[PDB]
Write an enzyme that holds these catalytic residues in place. Structure first.
Site, PDB file in Angstrom:
ATOM      1  N   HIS B 472       4.039  27.716 -33.087  1.00  0.00           N
ATOM      2  CA  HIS B 472       3.978  26.700 -34.127  1.00  0.00           C
ATOM      3  C   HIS B 472       4.228  27.376 -35.463  1.00  0.00           C
ATOM      4  O   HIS B 472       3.929  28.566 -35.615  1.00  0.00           O
ATOM      5  CB  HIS B 472       2.634  25.953 -34.125  1.00  0.00           C
ATOM      6  CG  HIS B 472       1.447  26.812 -33.829  1.00  0.00           C
ATOM      7  ND1 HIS B 472       0.882  27.651 -34.763  1.00  0.00           N
ATOM      8  CD2 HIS B 472       0.704  26.947 -32.706  1.00  0.00           C
ATOM      9  CE1 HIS B 472      -0.154  28.270 -34.227  1.00  0.00           C
ATOM     10  NE2 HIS B 472      -0.283  27.860 -32.979  1.00  0.00           N
ATOM     11  N   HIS B 479      -5.657  28.688 -37.508  1.00  0.00           N
ATOM     12  CA  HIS B 479      -7.031  29.218 -37.567  1.00  0.00           C
ATOM     13  C   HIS B 479      -7.555  29.286 -38.983  1.00  0.00           C
ATOM     14  O   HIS B 479      -8.745  29.450 -39.039  1.00  0.00           O
ATOM     15  CB  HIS B 479      -7.106  30.695 -37.250  1.00  0.00           C
ATOM     16  CG  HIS B 479      -7.063  31.086 -35.826  1.00  0.00           C
ATOM     17  ND1 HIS B 479      -6.308  30.457 -34.867  1.00  0.00           N
ATOM     18  CD2 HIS B 479      -7.689  32.086 -35.218  1.00  0.00           C
ATOM     19  CE1 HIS B 479      -6.447  31.115 -33.729  1.00  0.00           C
ATOM     20  NE2 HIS B 479      -7.315  32.072 -33.910  1.00  0.00           N
TER      21      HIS B 479
END
Ligand code: VO4
Ligand code: VO4
Ligand SMILES: [Br-]
Ligand SMILES: [Br-]
Ligand SMILES: [Ca+2]
Ligand SMILES: [Ca+2]
Lengths: 590, 590
Positions: B472, B479
């Site tokens: 991605h 995160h």
């Protein structure tokens, strides 16, 4: 339409779908007003079978002032901060120092303060996902005079006296005497030997257990709970560690691969040790009448348990009680999810993009992947807990199993002093002869160890928790509700029908995992149901919930998770559904 | 009104609150269509700075067919499984075996399969809580030509060369040579030394970093993140263990209290080991141009990393990069929540029933207690991840740091063969002289260790991940977004002002925790922001995200968690608010 408007319409559609399920009318079983004060001139309710913990009690375990409990119910229903703070929690306080006056010398020496009810008003709290806390009903609780309560108390007493026995050695010669004694005692109760009659409530028939054997003793009635070893794999075994992944044709074996069978989960890049803190063998709590009354008077005994150095895997029943003591209510199920993800257990085949990436050209992490299942399994916790907080406080308010042990203790002690009180657990006291004399011996030993040179006979339920139960009613069970919710989420997400190749059981003599003697097979759904049963019944081994509490709480949590999945499914535009096997054996596609 | 209707109205009110927030319009930066193909007769976009990982590439790092990237963009924007499934992910396959044809002998010997994009359609997915994945925005990513991108890629290269460098020894003479080299190289870049000018966009002004020193090298710009040791306590230290709770006037010391300073969290009854799987030191990945192109061509190198036996606390930069590899995106934040709960750190004083239970007569577990924050800090994760997916796929599609390293390497190698390609990364190549020389040395070492006897000069960004970055786009960062969201929840819940008495740091030459040379005071907010900084810059240490990715992702996660808390506060009928100190100093009351 606009994306903001589309999202608002999605939330409104989820709320409407929650509405369409309706409010199932939740009925209490009437113990609140059925039992009246035994004083001939007082007609006020005794509230012996209601959750009267925290309110002041007399020497016999009932509330001195009934209006204390009606104020408690009013504070529950209203949920106001000031009204809850206005309650008379705890006993009479010392005017000079403000410390409450405790019956037992232990609480007075500790200078204990009072502990409040754990989120009485949480039932009134609304939820943005899943059914409302009051939108789902739990069946009427077992009555003190019913044989179901007698069976629940027998089972909990038999766990209390067998808290030092090991799960792996249920069918072992050393524990054979006690296991057979417990089996004979359980099979001697009307609940177990006599089958359910026509006309009984459907939940009572469903939650009625059959003949108790070694293979189902202290086990739930969930599908897959009564098969294989007692302990679920996701409560003892670790997971495929970091580095034990197959890349291309080759498969690398992690140098820490021994941790998978050591009982060490691959918590992402770090490790969760499945070994539980070793609470001291044989040290039961609340075995003294004065200490029991102090705890009922909200004695803050939290953290008073003595622990042995180090940690070990769940082997004894007390170890499971410790495991469920400070459990995060999704710690077990987050552990199960992490084990399933690390072990490579694929998600539901009906979930999208679950095929090999050569076909679907998509990997599932945020949705229908590791992150999605983790987030759902830990977010189903709060809604389920609010539902169980409603079922505890605003409807049932069932007395805790330590409270029913106290009632039984005073009932069995009254003839010794020539009195006679609580003719409601009279059936329980009569029916639990051998169990209660074994309990009397155990509590005498525990009180002698506590410091009483010659303690008076006490048939109180031995309890693994120093503080006793958490400060909310027994019915329903918060850990069993979140058990049902989280295990249902995991079964809906993961390919729950997948058989488990390695069935591990804790060693008879060592603190390590070995292949179980079970020559059959266990599904992932079976393992998750067994884990829900383990966490629920570990509360029974703590003496903090009855079995019917556990089962009906598991069903309520299943409803919670089903509602959440139904509402969540509207968010994802992918063509998918959760192949979810319910606790009744039927599969619901969400 | 009815309770079902009241719950429906509360959910609709949360939806209306999310709607009234309004969609913040998220602008890309233009990298998609700005950079054309270098072929004189081809005007199609080269898409070098867009996320073209997965799609086939030539021997230079661009996509051979740009019309394959517009298909990827259409699949992103639409969401259909069938549309995603027909993309040309991976290279040209082999007509008989089916397995894709790879460029590198490693990927071909491994016989790898293609790996799919990680939920490219998750952005379109709606939510039942917080801001929609598209109702909040992130600023345009820095362009390749921008001096910011030069700084981010230089800092990531410096992190890659210093992955064997220890956090405790940042200011030590053993790494003082490389550390001073990194400081002098970063201070030379126009992004760091030159301050933000008037006119510059407010987000880039905010995310601009000043002079780089040892105390702020490889650190984020979050409040409290810059001060104190590098590592956050809630990533290295354990927590007050089971049995350490004080009862009344008597405080108990757990028999295993030495685990709270060992680095062993009290995961309720079990223990989370803060130690991390030791990745093989010095071994970097995707340092060969052929292997890097295969990864760009979707080579499933997942799990190919080699690990050393056992585990240790976060001590090297590689150890932090590994910590965030398999992180559950709430692993660190759930760890912080468990540490804070077990350590006894109080919740927000403004939360209700937070007083001693002799005043409020109520304990908080389900709401405003352990379970509430325990489940919010994780339930926020999937909403934050959906928002960051949207930001990654549907708008920005920023190329990964490995992709920017590949462009830089191809550009710097082109004069060696006499060609001249990628004028866009020319400024980054020319500023990164010494940095890319050290990168060439390190990549030569790694390629020699990987089997190549005489590797061709490679200026690729070395990365601690065999599979490279996940599938991605780097902007935003999953995160780091979940870092912002979860740390925001934790600060809004726990008393973020609480000063931490014991500030620990990993030993310079041992795998254990010792007190730190920091003589000042650090707060729960300080360590929570430092933990978000740690996770984000540990993604950077993996070479999978730039710094702007982390900071703007943290701001987006802060937005997500503020929205979720705002919608949640409607549900709770208690009078209360979260005293949340945002990432910009100011405190919002929710
Ligand atoms: O509600 V419980 O004490 O499981
Ligand atoms: O989006 V990431 O944190 O690799
Ligand atoms: Br609960
Ligand atoms: Br992500
Ligand atoms: Ca897939
Ligand atoms: Ca309180």
């Amino acid at each position: 339409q606009s994306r903001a408007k589309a999202s608002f319409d999605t939330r409104v559609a989820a709320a409407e779908l929650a509405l369409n399920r309706g409010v199932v009318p939740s009925f209490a079983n009437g113990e609140e007003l059925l039992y009246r004060n035994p004083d001939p001139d007082n007609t006020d309710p005794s509230f012996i079978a209601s959750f009267t913990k925290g309110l002041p009690h007399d020497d016999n375990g009932a509330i001195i002032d009934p209006d204390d409990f009606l104020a408690f119910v009013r504070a529950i229903n209203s949920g106001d901060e000031k009204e809850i703070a206005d309650l008379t929690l705890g006993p009479a306080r010392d005017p000079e120092t403000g410390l409450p006056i405790w019956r037992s010398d232990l609480a007075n020496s500790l200078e204990l303060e009072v502990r409040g009810w754990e989120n009485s008003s949480a039932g009134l709290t609304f939820d943005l996902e899943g059914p409302d806390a009051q939108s789902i009903a739990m069946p009427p609780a077992p009555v003190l005079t019913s044989p179901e309560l007698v069976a629940e108390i027998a089972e909990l007493y038999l766990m209390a006296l067998g808290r030092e026995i090991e799960f792996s050695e249920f069918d072992s010669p050393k524990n054979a005497e006690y296991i057979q004694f417990a089996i004979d005692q359980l099979n001697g109760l009307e609940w177990f030997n006599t089958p359910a009659k026509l006309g009984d409530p459907p939940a009572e028939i469903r939650r009625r257990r059959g003949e108790v054997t070694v293979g189902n003793l202290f086990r739930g009635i969930l599908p897959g709970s009564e098969v294989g070893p007692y302990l679920s794999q996701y409560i003892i075994v670790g997971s495929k560690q970091i580095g034990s992944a197959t890349v291309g044709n080759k498969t690398l074996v992690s140098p820490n691969a021994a941790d998978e069978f050591d009982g060490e989960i691959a918590y992402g890049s770090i490790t969760i040790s499945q070994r539980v803190r070793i609470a001291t063998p044989g040290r039961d709590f609340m075995t003294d009448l004065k200490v029991f009354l102090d705890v009922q008077d909200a004695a803050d005994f939290r953290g008073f348990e003595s622990y042995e150095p180090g940690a070990r895997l769940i082997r004894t029943i007390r170890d499971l009680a410790t495991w469920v003591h400070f459990d995060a209510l999704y710690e077990a199920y987050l552990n199960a999810c992490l084990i399933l993800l690390a072990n490579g257990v694929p998600f539901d085949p009906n979930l999208p993009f679950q095929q090999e990436d050569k076909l679907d050209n998509q990997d599932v992490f945020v949705n229908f992947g590791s992150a999605h299942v983790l987030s759902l399994v830990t977010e189903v916790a709060t809604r389920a807990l609010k539902a169980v907080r409603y079922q505890k406080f605003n409807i049932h308010r069932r007395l805790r199993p330590e409270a029913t042990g106290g009632l039984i203790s005073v009932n069995k002690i009254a003839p010794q002093k020539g009195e006679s009180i609580f003719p409601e657990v009279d059936l329980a006291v009569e029916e639990l002869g051998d169990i209660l004399e074994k309990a009397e011996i155990s509590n005498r030993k525990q009180n002698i160890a506590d410091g009483d040179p010659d303690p008076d006979p006490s048939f109180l339920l031995p309890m693994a928790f120093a503080e006793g139960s958490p400060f909310h009613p027994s019915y329903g069970s918060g850990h069993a509700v979140v058990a049902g919710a989280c295990v249902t989420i995991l079964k809906a997400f993961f390919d729950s029908g997948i058989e488990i190749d390695q069935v591990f059981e804790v060693d008879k003599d060592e603190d390590k995992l070995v292949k179980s003697s079970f020559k059959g097979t266990l599904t992932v759904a079976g393992e998750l149901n067994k884990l829900a049963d383990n966490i629920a019944i570990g509360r029974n081994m703590a003496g903090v919930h009855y079995f019917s509490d556990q089962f009906e709480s598991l069903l309520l949590g299943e409803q919670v998770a089903i509602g959440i999945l139904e509402e969540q499914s509207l968010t994802y535009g992918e063509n998918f559904f959760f192949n979810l096997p319910k606790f009744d054996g039927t599969t619901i596609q969400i």
